Design a protein around this ligand. Sequence first.
Ligand SMILES: *[C@@H]1O[C@H](CO[C@@H]2O[C@@H](C)[C@@H](O)[C@@H](O)[C@@H]2O)[C@@H](O[C@@H]2O[C@H](CO)[C@@H](O[C@@H]3O[C@H](CO[C@H]4O[C@H](CO)[C@@H](O)[C@H](O)[C@@H]4O)[C@@H](O)[C@H](O[C@H]4O[C@H](CO)[C@@H](O)[C@H](O)[C@@H]4O)[C@@H]3O)[C@H](O)[C@H]2NC(C)=O)[C@H](O)[C@H]1NC(C)=O
Ligand SMILES: *[C@@H]1O[C@H](CO[C@@H]2O[C@@H](C)[C@@H](O)[C@@H](O)[C@@H]2O)[C@@H](O[C@@H]2O[C@H](CO)[C@@H](O[C@@H]3O[C@H](CO[C@H]4O[C@H](CO)[C@@H](O)[C@H](O)[C@@H]4O)[C@@H](O)[C@H](O[C@H]4O[C@H](CO)[C@@H](O)[C@H](O)[C@@H]4O)[C@@H]3O)[C@H](O)[C@H]2NC(C)=O)[C@H](O)[C@H]1NC(C)=O
Lengths: 95, 95
Amino acid sequence: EVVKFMDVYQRSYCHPIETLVDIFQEYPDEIEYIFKPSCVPLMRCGGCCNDEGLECVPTEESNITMQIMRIKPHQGQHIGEMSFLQHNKCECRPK
Amino acid sequence: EVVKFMDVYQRSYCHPIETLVDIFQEYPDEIEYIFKPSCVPLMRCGGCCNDEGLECVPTEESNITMQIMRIKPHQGQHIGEMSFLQHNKCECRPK
Ligand SMILES: *[C@@H]1O[C@H](CO[C@@H]2O[C@@H](C)[C@@H](O)[C@@H](O)[C@@H]2O)[C@@H](O[C@@H]2O[C@H](CO)[C@@H](O[C@@H]3O[C@H](CO[C@H]4O[C@H](CO)[C@@H](O)[C@H](O)[C@@H]4O)[C@@H](O)[C@H](O[C@H]4O[C@H](CO)[C@@H](O)[C@H](O)[C@@H]4O)[C@@H]3O)[C@H](O)[C@H]2NC(C)=O)[C@H](O)[C@H]1NC(C)=O
Ligand SMILES: *[C@@H]1O[C@H](CO[C@@H]2O[C@@H](C)[C@@H](O)[C@@H](O)[C@@H]2O)[C@@H](O[C@@H]2O[C@H](CO)[C@@H](O[C@@H]3O[C@H](CO[C@H]4O[C@H](CO)[C@@H](O)[C@H](O)[C@@H]4O)[C@@H](O)[C@H](O[C@H]4O[C@H](CO)[C@@H](O)[C@H](O)[C@@H]4O)[C@@H]3O)[C@H](O)[C@H]2NC(C)=O)[C@H](O)[C@H]1NC(C)=O
């Protein structure tokens, strides 16, 4: 029934969380294509540091490549590869 | 190396995602205690519907109870149980 404190505390603490990002936020200069899916799951830092002096920030990043469908209205659809930034490691660091 | 389209498409599609929420957003009337952890992991609907006419919304919800530390500055700390709303099922429904 009840989630124990140690489990809550660990699961909430700053780390990379699977985060759903709109592709246009990552590719805001795209003006020719619609994408499917319109969002992608990326690991990005989040959670809490329990210290107003610290913020959760990435300390290691990398790209992940995904197949995404690009649609040109009434002209066709194609699968292409697009890379997105992910966070591999996060830490609570002084603001 | 490359995440295949079917995998991207399924993982991004509307469903409950573990989401880190500040406890004061859920308990905005709290004026006496600091909480540790300051945020909690809750399943909440998110992701995409790939249709401008649809939005991802919860269709079934429940509470989850977690042990959270409440701190009264310089007067002590105690573990208490606090419930949070989670989303069990999500669907893409007409806006
Ligand atoms: C993740 O992958 C990125 C490449 O991804 C591919 O290409 C993109 C466009 C998509 O198609 C994707 O689907 C592909 O898989 C890769 O990007 C590289 O990022 C670095 C920065 O981290 C860029 O170097 C810096 O460029 C800027 C200027 O940026 C503009 O101009 C360049 C052309 O020169 C373009 O290529 C850019 O995209 C922008 O249009 C410079 O200002 C900067 O110099 C300054 O910063 C460095 C420190 O980083 C200092 O040492 C310098 O002295 C300056 O202070 C860099 O030169 C690089 O251009 C970019 N490449 C490409 C092809 O876009 C990224 O690195 C990958 N990340 C990881 C973690 O692997
Ligand atoms: C999840 O758990 C909730 C209870 O959680 C516990 O209590 C809270 C405060 C924390 O301490 C937590 O850690 C505990 O574990 C449970 O909450 C219940 O929610 C329902 C609504 O879903 C409430 O009923 C509605 O009340 C409102 C008025 O709300 C205020 O007044 C009441 C006092 O009457 C308080 O109890 C509230 O908290 C607010 O201060 C009414 O307007 C409403 O009537 C209208 O809506 C219904 C349809 O829902 C119609 O049929 C009516 O005719 C009206 O149109 C309801 O009466 C209930 O008060 C609240 N209980 C408590 C103890 O707060 C929640 O239901 C749980 N969720 C699930 C999915 O299980």
